[PDB]
């Protein structure tokens, strides 16, 4: 009942196994020019296929939505809502995701977590009124999680 | 905004302490867990000695950030305000849900890898308050809290150790 | 050589197993800990299913890397070939050194945060081989091995659970 | 117990230098990561943070271990196949990633972003350390210095509010 809920929750906000893959493609496009955008997608599918990751996305977005619609007691409400730089509970879940496939993909998550290419740029809410404080972290975390797998099979 | 940011992030300790008290946890009963872990290695160890450390860990934003988020979900899941399937999963406190363990680690790391073993150790032996927080009969949902209470105890011991 | 790299990173498993044997640890013995960790909940648990789970853990590149590294270090500290002060810190299983626990956590994480609490727990009670590995008088350094065997049993444990 | 070992900050420092890395070189990386976010951020400020980090036992522990392996590897004293795996800096071997993340966590999760970032930019000594044709093994020190910078950088943030 999880593998599923995950993707519709992911989609429900505006993220697809597609743009996610567009990211994994960026992290290893230069190193694997010989590869299909489909390849990326399946690693992404396998990342999202593991419980620990799904176990998070729910928790992650649950807070994002819960903060956006703000039923959060203060100052937690404000903290999350303002994607506070000294607040790191989000990056923690992000880490568990990236950690699923091992140490190998850490420097990765940290690069797209700063830079923020593709949809990560969007999810940093360009004032979309929405709160993507956690997903912006779990998303990129899933990407680099896939980058670490993509290499574990090639 | 920029200054409202600083004000908010520098004023979490008091609130984090209150919530703990509001869920049944006392800095002292946590310190009680610290004596349980560090006693053996420290006969001379004082209860006040521990309290100090417990207070030390709690004075950390990373830990507040943890303590707040933890007791936040613990409540919504207790007031059934959470969406499904998160609501039930968290309310049930099932062994396949790990996030309640991912948060506790971030507290434990605050003082290093050394505290890892003690953490899992009291998370199993559930001595002191942990007993009450893991009790599913009380009607209260302590999915996250009994993990962070144990983590805080661990981290305090990790810090106590770094001091000796 | 890149093809040589593939050949190497793809063939670490049995080496990892041998090194464990050379250091006195058998898959069985590790399996026995998984037993201890899960027999109270699955009385009908067969030692076979335990082994199958421990083998699956060790089949992980991650674990293999941790095993080779930690044993390599115990071996070096044992033949006093490390440089001071690392040499004493590892040979004497120094109290504030957590590099061994850091390596273990990478094994535990292989199967999630669930196996964390079990790892710290067993990494305290020190049953089965752990008792030997911790001994401290056999003239053998097992500072890293101790933790990694504990970590594997705990990851195996977590896997067994995820399945049951 | 043999918990005994007091601060190894001074020894950690020497091992770093002896491997061609100064607190100053690491500080420069801290500037490179915070200079842009802080007006008149001074080098003194960078070195402080770098020193605060390097003074933590958690970090020291990582530094001694990481460097130690790098040394044994370039001297060809490890056991095969670990010897080649470490010497060749095998990308699928992540124990060095492990030790580095170790250093990062000493100062929160804010460092994860800079660790990755300076990891790819590879400025300053990171160019020397990452070379691969100096006949020197820096499989571990590489990540370690990148991590030390990240942590100090993270520390510098917390100590700004």
List domains and CATH numbers for chain D. 1-161 (1.10.3760.10)
What is d(CA B152, CA B131) in angstroms, rounded to the nearest whole number?
16
Tokens 């008792």, located at residue: C131
Cα angle C82, C103, A91; round to 5: 135
Q: Are D115 and D147 in contact (CB under 8 A)?
A: yes
Interface of C with D (CB under 8 A): 5, 8-9, 12, 15, 61-62, 65-66, 68-69, 72-73, 75-76, 81-83, 85-86, 88-89, 92-99, 102-103, 106
Cα angle D143, C120, B55; round to 5: 80
What is d(CA C59, CA C36) in angstroms, rounded to the nearest whole number?
22
Nearest to A103 among D98, D112, D116 (CB): D98
| CA atoms within 13 A of residue D114's CA, in its CB half-sphere | 32
When scoring D108, D110, D151, D155 by the number of chain B Cβ atoms within 10 A, the one with the most, hence best to mutate, is D108
Sign of the C-alpha dihedral, residues C5, C7, C11, C15?
negative
Burial tier of B4 (Cβ tally within 10 Å: 0-12, 13-18, 19+): exposed
Q: Are C140 and C78 in contact (CB under 8 A)?
A: yes
Cα angle A31, D118, A43; round to 5: 35
- C-to-D residue pairs, Cβ atoms closer than 8 angstroms: 81
Residues in A touching C112 (Cβ below 8 Å): 51-52
- Where chain D is discontinuous (C–N > 2.5 Å), the residues before each break are none
Angle between helices D95-105 and D139-158 (to 10 degrees): 20
Residues in A touching C106 (Cβ below 8 Å): 102-103
When scoring A61, A87, A88 by the number of chain B Cβ atoms within 10 A, the one with the most, hence best to mutate, is A87
Q: Are D2 and C95 in contact (CB under 8 A)?
A: yes
- Of all residues in chain B, the one with the smallest CA distance to A65 is B83
A51 with C162: Cβ contact below 8 A: yes
* Residue B148 neighbours by CB under 8 Å, 6+ apart: B66, B67, B70, B103, B104, B107
Nearest to D88 among C5, C81, C86 (CB): C5
Angle between helices C61-78 and D95-105 (to 10 degrees): 80
Neighbours of B159 (CB within 10 A): 20
Instruction: Record the tokens describing residue C114, joined without a space.
Output: 């669930």
The dihedrals phi and psi of D2, each to the nearest 5 degrees, come to -90, 30
Burial tier of A4 (Cβ tally within 10 Å: 0-12, 13-18, 19+): exposed
Query: For residue B42, what are the CA distances in angstroms to A101, A143, B46, B99, D100?
Result: 40, 47, 9, 33, 32
Residue C112: which of A138, D99, B99, A148 has the closest Cα? Answer: B99
Q: Are D9 and D54 in contact (CB under 8 A)?
A: yes
Instruction: Record the tokens describing residue B64, joined without a space.
Output: 């507040």
What is d(CA D144, CA D64) in angstroms, rounded to the nearest whole number?
10
Omega before B85 within 30 of 0, i.e. cis: yes
When scoring D38, D105, D157 by the number of chain B Cβ atoms within 10 A, the one with the most, hence best to mutate, is D105
Tokens 């971030």, located at residue: B106
What is d(CA D57, CA C130) in angstroms, rounded to the nearest whole number?
27
Query: For residue D126, what are the CA distances in angstroms to A37, D51, D68, D113, D149?
Result: 33, 18, 19, 17, 11
Q: Are A97 and A47 in contact (CB under 8 A)?
A: yes
What is d(CA A94, CA D128) in angstroms, rounded to the nearest whole number?
31
Q: Are C147 and C103 in contact (CB under 8 A)?
A: yes
Cα angle B35, B36, B42; round to 5: 55
Neighbours of C81 (CB within 10 A): 11
Query: For residue D97, what are the CA distances in angstroms to C134, D90, D116, D144, D146?
Result: 27, 11, 11, 8, 10
Neighbours of C88 (CB within 10 A): 16
Instruction: Record the tokens describing residue C130, joined without a space.
Output: 């752990």
* Residue B32 neighbours by CB under 8 Å, 6+ apart: B47, B50, B128, B129
Q: Are A77 and A124 in contact (CB under 8 A)?
A: no
Label residues A122-142 b or e (16+ Cβ within 10 Å = b). bbebeeeebbbbbbbbbbbbb
Neighbours of D64 (CB within 10 A): 25
Instruction: Record the tokens describing residue B114, joined without a space.
Output: 């050394």
Nearest to C8 among D4, D69, D85 (CB): D85
């Amino acid at each position: 009942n999880l593998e599923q809920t995950a993707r519709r929750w992911l989609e429900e906000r505006g993220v697809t196994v597609e743009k996610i893959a567009e990211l994994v493609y960026y992290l290893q496009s230069k190193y694997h020019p010989d590869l299909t955008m489909e390849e990326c997608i399946e690693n992404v599918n396998r990342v999202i296929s593991k419980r620990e990751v799904q176990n998070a996305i729910l928790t992650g977005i649950q807070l994002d939505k819960l903060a956006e619609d703000g039923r959060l007691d203060e100052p937690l409400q404000s903290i999350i809502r303002r994607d506070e730089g000294l607040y790191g509970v989000d990056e923690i879940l992000a880490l568990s995701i990236v950690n699923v496939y091992g140490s190998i993909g850490f420097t990765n998550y940290g690069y797209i977590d700063k830079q923020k290419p593709g949809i990560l740029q969007y999810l940093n809410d360009k004032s979309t009124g929405k709160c993507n404080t956690f997903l912006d972290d779990i998303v990129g975390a899933i990407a680099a999680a896939a980058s670490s797998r993509l290499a574990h099979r090639a």
